[PDB]
Amino acid sequence: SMQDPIADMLTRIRNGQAANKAAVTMPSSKLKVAIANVLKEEGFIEDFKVEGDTKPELELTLKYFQGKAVVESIQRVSRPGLRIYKRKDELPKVMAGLGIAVVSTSKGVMTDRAARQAGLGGEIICYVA
Amino acid sequence: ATVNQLVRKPRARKVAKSNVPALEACPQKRGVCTRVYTTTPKKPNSALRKVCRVRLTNGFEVTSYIGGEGHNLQEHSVILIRGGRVKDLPGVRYHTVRGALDCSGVKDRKQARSKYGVKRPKA
Amino acid sequence: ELQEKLIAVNRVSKTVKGGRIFSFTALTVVGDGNGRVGFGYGKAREVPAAIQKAMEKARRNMINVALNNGTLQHPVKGVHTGSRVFMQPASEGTGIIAGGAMRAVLEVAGVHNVLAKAYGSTNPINVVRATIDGLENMNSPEMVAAKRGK
Amino acid sequence: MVTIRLARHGAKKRPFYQVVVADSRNARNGRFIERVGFFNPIASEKEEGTRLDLDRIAHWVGQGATISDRVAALIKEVNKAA
Amino acid sequence: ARYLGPKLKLSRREGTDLFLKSGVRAIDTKCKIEQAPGQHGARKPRLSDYGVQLREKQKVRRIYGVLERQFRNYYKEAARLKGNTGENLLALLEGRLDNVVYRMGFGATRAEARQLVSHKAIMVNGRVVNIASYQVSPNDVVSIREKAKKQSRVKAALELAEQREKPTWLEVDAGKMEGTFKRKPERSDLSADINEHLIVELYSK
Amino acid sequence: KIRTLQGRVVSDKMEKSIVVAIERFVKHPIYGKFIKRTTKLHVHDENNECGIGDVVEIRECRPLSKTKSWTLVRVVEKAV
RNA sequence: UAGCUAGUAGGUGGGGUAACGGCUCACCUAGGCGACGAUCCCUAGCUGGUCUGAGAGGAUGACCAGCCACACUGGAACUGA
RNA sequence: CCCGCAGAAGAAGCACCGGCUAACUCCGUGCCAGCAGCCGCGGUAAUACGGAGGGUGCAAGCGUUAAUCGGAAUUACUGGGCGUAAAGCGCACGCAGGCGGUUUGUUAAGUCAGAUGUGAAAUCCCCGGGCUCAACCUGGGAACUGCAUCUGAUACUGGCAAG
């Protein structure tokens, strides 16, 4: 948003999930698209799609097992005000491995399992669960 | 509570003062026992409590409780005091040690003897 | 089989037109040691009737816990009316390291390896609600895999 | 001056010695440069009364480190046992 | 310091039988079991959450005859070992030389076993050990010294020992009176009703 | 080439010497925030080749005076 | 405790030192430090460690080891590696 | 250290027992004497005070005092709050400071990775070894979660450039 557009996107996701909304939209960034890739390849959302050229818009599609949203929590971790960086041996297990941490590694934005595999840490973007 | 607010002036951990100041972290102190009297406690309890006004070797003048069932202290005797207040009138937080110096173990005491300075009866 | 155990009982009163009359409330937890627990809260003019009314309240309102092996799936948080509890799984041979109503709920529910603490007000009615709430929101790998992946 | 001497450790009446390379002005078992083995005097069938690791002693003697008499006796013993 | 008081009154507070008065007379015919041991014995013994943890810890101590300082140290070591702390603790208690001499028959009660151990009349691997808390390991050889193989009490203790169940984890010979600690007994073959989790809860706070 | 701290001039009024502040971005020990810390540092330039705001490399040398043990290496940004 | 500082900050020469150096001196320049806490006041030997704590932390710095500083108080040197 | 010598022979205490807190009865006393960490107890019983008998706990110790951390999420980094419980400045504007939409490029400061050097020994921890066992001693290891340097990465933050 005004200062933290990535907590904006997570706030939109969890607000739209608690509102039982089918799809949320927000102004796109390339890192918004990166985290969206991580989520939709982890099965936390259905899909996304960025439309627009001068004003792209990221179209996340939320996902409900029945009447309950797939995401319970999604919390911003590193924010402007605390940046969080972890070495690969101290990357966080989110809900005992049942939920992901999306980290920003120097080989891109990946999940936490992927990062501790590839032996490189980085900036902890959020906890999804 | 903001991280800048805490970086700029960190959290001050409150310091709690001792409620036995005159000891000064010594477990006991020696006092001079200027006067003995029998003061009256708070409104719920009705009794006269044996108390002495004692001047410690460190300059503190302070009020001590002569506990136990009996008494021998006088107007100059040299005694030893230890912490612990009594629900008596405000200002009593020291507790004379019976049997330690000029104080004596209470008489014909046979339970909790070590707390009154009375030695084991030969039986 | 259902394990039973009383948590607490006190002696609430009520000022009547003349003097003041009395009652009793009892808080009980019921479970089977296989991940089902429920609590109950009965009031009566006398303690035994309060305890029984509590026990029937508790034998309905049974939930399902998705235990792992005598411990928890993952660390879990619970709140209810200013009563925050934290449970996490432990290793085998670690007991129920838990407090008051925490211990009783974790016991009758079939947990043996927990590491628990309660933070806010430790009023038993609220800590037991907080604990039951935390337990019922716990996810096991089966349903999390079902709801998102494989 | 650098001497290879014994630093007395262990317990009372059960001496254990560290063979230590040290500046000779330090206290016996005070500041040292290097540990080069140990000596256990009260070990009779008890195994390994002396380990020296003599390459480092050789290195330090080649630099003008003197030996104490007890360490020298210990070196003879280790060499003979070999 | 041991405990030198009346043996049965210690068992009656614990309720269950403790094997610390052993022989022919088969207690409850010895003396009045199952009343807690005092003027209010008949009074109801219903007791709190901390009272049952305390009661069993007390019972385990009274069986082996270990005081609270050593028992606390046993718990510390058991809780430091790898594995569950309760069976760690029972195994430490059962590897005690006091106990092993008792369980090998020679030695009537664990206090007579301790009387033997203390009195320079047991050899572990061919040399005299007189520490009761000495730990026996798998494959020691506990044996009565020759000077004490003619003792009548050890011979008498042997007979009233096969009526007692013989532990699997250790193997003993009565002719040449001598035994062998084979393995650390498992929780299962420790034939008892010890609920070690209340003990580990007792010291866990 | 030994360490070559890389900083920015802040005063050029001592003759033959400048003062050079170095910014480091360190993590706060307890709060975990990344803060900015400054290190002002009297440096020696023989030729008065530096002006305020310039961005300069320095290296460490023998002590040239009281509180002057760094010497100028280069000017990387002759900012005016 | 909000300003502090005239070998004060720098520079050239002398000198001095085992050695670099305002270390010292003569001249020159007029700086330097400070709100990222100067200055001033108060307290305090420092560390490995210790205790406590699930931890993060708190509290400590007895013994042992390492470093500092002191030797009635204040000055000063000599001798000497 | 081993051996012999008699002989149970030379060798138990201290706290507590209303609730918290394991363990209760009788006498005495009568808001006195006293107790007390808190709640509180004592005006004819009073399982709470003194004695007893009994019991509980610990044991060559046991209690008390002091003191530190804990419990205390009761300064909350992890890990708290500010409508009314304590707490939004009376209100703005605003410098420092903190934070900063989007896309390229670059750099490589943060960050991450690898390496290397260092992180004394002792201590702590693991596996052993010696003391009859233990404490204690000791071997090897791990750890020292740090600091620096070099090589690399470039998502993100910073820089620089261009939008």
DSSP states of chain C: --EEEEEEEE--EEE-SSSEEE-EEEEEEEEETTTEEEEEEEEESSHHHHHHHHHHHHHSS-EE---SSSB-SS-EEEESSS-EEEEEE--TT--EE--SHHHHHHHHTT--BEEEEE-S---HHHHHHHHHHHHHT---HHHHHHHT--
C-beta neighbour count of E113 within 10 angstroms: 27
Identify the helix (H) or strand (E) that includes residue A10.
helix A5-18
Residue E69 backbone dihedrals phi, psi, to 5 degrees: -70, -50
Domain boundaries, position B44? 1-123
Q: Which residue in chain F has the smallest CA separation from B6?
A: F31
Q: Closest CA to H34 C1' — which residue?
A: B69
C-beta neighbour count of E167 within 10 angstroms: 20
Q: The tokens 């040290």 sit on which residue?
A: D22
User: Do residues A34 and A109 make contact, with C-beta atoms less than 8 angstroms apart?
Assistant: yes
Residues E46-59, buried b or exposed e (16+ Cβ, 10 A)? eeeeeeebebbbbb
User: Do residues E100 and E110 make contact, with C-beta atoms less than 8 angstroms apart?
Assistant: no
Give the integer Cα–Cα distance in Å for B77 and F12.
Answer: 77
The first and second tokens of residue D19, run together, are 């063979």
Ramachandran region of residue A108, left (φ > 0), alpha (ψ -120 to 50) or beta? left
The nucleotide closest to D9 (CA, C1' atoms): H137
| Among A residues 76-105, those touching chain B with beta carbons less than 8 Å apart | 81-82
Residue E90 backbone dihedrals phi, psi, to 5 degrees: -65, -35
DSSP lists the bridge partners of residue C38 as C30
Give the integer Cα–Cα distance in Å for B53 and B31.
Answer: 9
The nucleotide closest to F24 (CA, C1' atoms): H109
Q: C-alpha distances in angstroms, A16 versus C94, E64, F56?
A: 41, 65, 52
C-beta neighbour count of B55 within 10 angstroms: 15
CA B85-B103-B111 angle, to 5 degrees, is 75
Looking only at the bridges linking them, the beta strands covering B92-96 and B61-65 are parallel
Q: How far is C75 from chain A (nearest CA, A)?
A: 7
Resolution of this entry, Å: 2.7
Please tell me the number of Cα atoms within 13 Å of E80 on its side-chain side: 7
- Closest residue by Cα to residue E144 from E105, E183, E99, E170: E105
Can you tell me whether residue A101 is helix, strand or coil?
Answer: strand
Q: C-alpha distances in angstroms, A100 versus A113, A123, C136?
A: 8, 14, 21
DSSP code for A88: G
Distance of CA E71 to the CA centre of its chain: 13
User: Do residues A80 and A49 make contact, with C-beta atoms less than 8 angstroms apart?
Assistant: no
Q: C-alpha distances in angstroms, D28 versus B116, D3, D16?
A: 52, 11, 13
Can you tell me whether residue E200 is helix, strand or coil?
Answer: helix
The first and second tokens of residue E104, run together, are 């090998």
- The answer for residues whose C-beta is within 8 angstroms of residue D19's C-beta and 6 or more apart is D4, D6, D35, D36, D37, D38, D39, D52, D57, D71, D74
Give the integer Cα–Cα distance in Å for E176 and A103.
Answer: 71
Distance of CA C148 to the CA centre of its chain: 30
- Closest residue by Cα to residue C115 from C141, C79, C143, C85: C85
Looking only at the bridges linking them, the beta strands covering D34-39 and D50-51 are antiparallel
SS3 readout for chain D = CEEEEEEEEEECCEEEEEEEEEECCCCCCCCCCEEEEEECCCCCCCCCCEECCHHHHHHHHCCCCEECHHHHHHHHHHHHHC
| Among F residues 25-64, those touching chain B with beta carbons less than 8 Å apart | 28, 30-33, 35
Residue B56 backbone dihedrals phi, psi, to 5 degrees: -75, 160
C-beta neighbour count of A57 within 10 angstroms: 12
Please classify residue A102 by burial: count the beta carbons closer than 10 Å to its beta carbon, then call 0-12 exposed, 13-18 middle and 19+ buried: buried
User: Do residues B82 and B66 make contact, with C-beta atoms less than 8 angstroms apart?
Assistant: no
CA C71-A101-F35 angle, to 5 degrees, is 120
Architecture of the domain defined by E7-93+190-203: Orthogonal Bundle (1.10)
Give the integer Cα–Cα distance in Å for A22 and A69.
Answer: 10
CA E148-E154-E155 angle, to 5 degrees, is 105
Q: Which residue in chain C has the smallest CA separation from A64?
A: C147
The nucleotide closest to E117 (CA, C1' atoms): H132
Asked if A96 and C75 come within 8 Å (Cβ–Cβ), the reply is: yes
- The answer for residues whose C-beta is within 8 angstroms of residue E176's C-beta and 6 or more apart is none
What does the radius of gyration of chain E's CA atoms come to, in whole angstroms? 17
- Closest residue by Cα to residue D21 from D53, D55, D56: D56
The first and second tokens of residue E102, run together, are 């008792």
- The answer for residues whose C-beta is within 8 angstroms of residue B40's C-beta and 6 or more apart is B46, B47, B48, B49, B89
- The answer for residues whose C-beta is within 8 angstroms of residue D78's C-beta and 6 or more apart is D50, D52, D54
Give the integer Cα–Cα distance in Å for B92 and B81.
Answer: 12
Give the integer Cα–Cα distance in Å for F15 and B91.
Answer: 70
CATH of residue B70's domain is 2.40.50.140
Give the integer Cα–Cα distance in Å for E15 and E10.
Answer: 9
User: Do residues C125 and C61 make contact, with C-beta atoms less than 8 angstroms apart?
Assistant: no
Give the integer Cα–Cα distance in Å for D17 and D36.
Answer: 11
Q: Give A83's contacts in chain F (Cβ within 8 Å).
A: 34
Most A CBs within 10 Å: which of F25, F34, F35, F36, as the mutation test of the A interface? Answer: F34
DSSP lists the bridge partners of residue E170 as E181
- Closest residue by Cα to residue E185 from E202, E168, E200: E168
DSSP code for A110: E
User: Do residues C107 and C3 make contact, with C-beta atoms less than 8 angstroms apart?
Assistant: yes
The topology (CATH level 3) of E94-181 is: 3.10.290
For CA atoms F59, F64, F65, F66, give the dihedral sign.
positive
Task: Please report, in angstroms and rounded to a whole number, the separation of the first and last CA atoms in chain A.
Answer: 23
User: Do residues B35 and B77 make contact, with C-beta atoms less than 8 angstroms apart?
Assistant: no
Looking only at the bridges linking them, the beta strands covering E142-144 and E122-124 are antiparallel
The first and second tokens of residue C7, run together, are 């948590």
CB of A81 within 8 Å of a chain F CB? The answer is: yes
Residues D34-45, buried b or exposed e (16+ Cβ, 10 A)? eebbbbbeeeee
Q: C-alpha distances in angstroms, F73 versus A35, A52, D10, F47?
A: 44, 50, 57, 12
The nucleotide closest to F46 (CA, C1' atoms): G11
Give the integer Cα–Cα distance in Å for A76 and A78.
Answer: 6
Give the integer Cα–Cα distance in Å for B43 and B64.
Answer: 20
CB distance under 7 Å to strand G: residues = B 13; D 26-27, 29-31; F 11, 13-17, 19, 23, 29-30, 36-38, 40, 42, 44, 62-68
Give the integer Cα–Cα distance in Å for A109 and D11.
Answer: 59
DSSP states of E59-121: HHHHHHT--HHHHHHHHHHHHHSSS-HHHHHHHHHHTBHHHHHHHTSSSSSHHHHHHHHHTT-
The first and second tokens of residue B77, run together, are 């005797």
Q: Which residue in chain A has the smallest CA separation from C147?
A: A65
**E19-28 own/partner pairs: CB under 8 Å, 24+ apart:** E19/E63, E19/E109, E19/E110, E20/E62, E20/E63, E20/E65, E20/E109, E20/E110, E20/E111, E21/E109, E22/E108, E22/E109, E22/E160, E23/E108, E23/E160, E24/E160
Q: C-alpha distances in angstroms, A33 versus A38, A51, A123, C31, E131?
A: 9, 12, 17, 47, 73
Looking only at the bridges linking them, the beta strands covering C76-79 and B61-65 are unpaired
Q: Give F31's contacts in chain A (Cβ within 8 Å).
A: 82
- Closest residue by Cα to residue C96 from C117, C75, C111: C111
The first and second tokens of residue E122, run together, are 């047991």
Please tell me the number of Cα atoms within 13 Å of A1 on its side-chain side: 8
Experimental approach was cryo-EM
Q: The tokens 């709801």 sit on which residue?
A: C147
Asked if E204 and C93 come within 8 Å (Cβ–Cβ), the reply is: no
Residues followed by a break in chain C (C to N exceeding 2.5 Å) are: none
Q: What angle do the packed helices E85-94 and E49-64 form, to 10 degrees?
A: 30
Q: What angle do the packed helices E110-118 and E152-162 form, to 10 degrees?
A: 150
Q: Give E83's contacts in chain C (Cβ within 8 Å).
A: 93
Give the integer Cα–Cα distance in Å for E3 and C83.
Answer: 47
C-beta neighbour count of E183 within 10 angstroms: 12
DSSP states of chain B: --HHHHHHS---PPPPPPS-GGGTT-SEEEE---EEEEE---TT----EEEEEEEBTTS-EEEEE--SS-----SS--EEEEE---SSSTTEEEEE-TTTSS--PPTT--SSGGGTTPPPP--
CB of A23 within 8 Å of a chain F CB? The answer is: no
Can you tell me whether residue E154 is helix, strand or coil?
Answer: helix
The first and second tokens of residue B60, run together, are 């503190």
Q: How far is C18 from chain E (nearest CA, A)?
A: 38
Domain boundaries, position D53? 1-82
Q: Which residue in chain B has the smallest CA separation from F36?
A: B7
Q: C-alpha distances in angstroms, C146 versus A53, A66, B21, C150, D9?
A: 37, 11, 65, 7, 64
Q: The tokens 């440096």 sit on which residue?
A: F43
Q: How far is A43 from chain B (nearest CA, A)?
A: 35
DSSP lists the bridge partners of residue A75 as A127
User: Do residues E38 and E52 make contact, with C-beta atoms less than 8 angstroms apart?
Assistant: no
CA C98-C102-C105 angle, to 5 degrees, is 125
DSSP code for A118: T
Are E and F close enough to touch, i.e. 3+ CB pairs under 8 angstroms?
A: no
Q: Which residue in chain E has the smallest CA separation from C96?
A: E201
- Can you point out the beta strands (E) in chain A? 23-27, 50-51, 57-61, 74-76, 85-86, 101-105, 108-110, 122-128
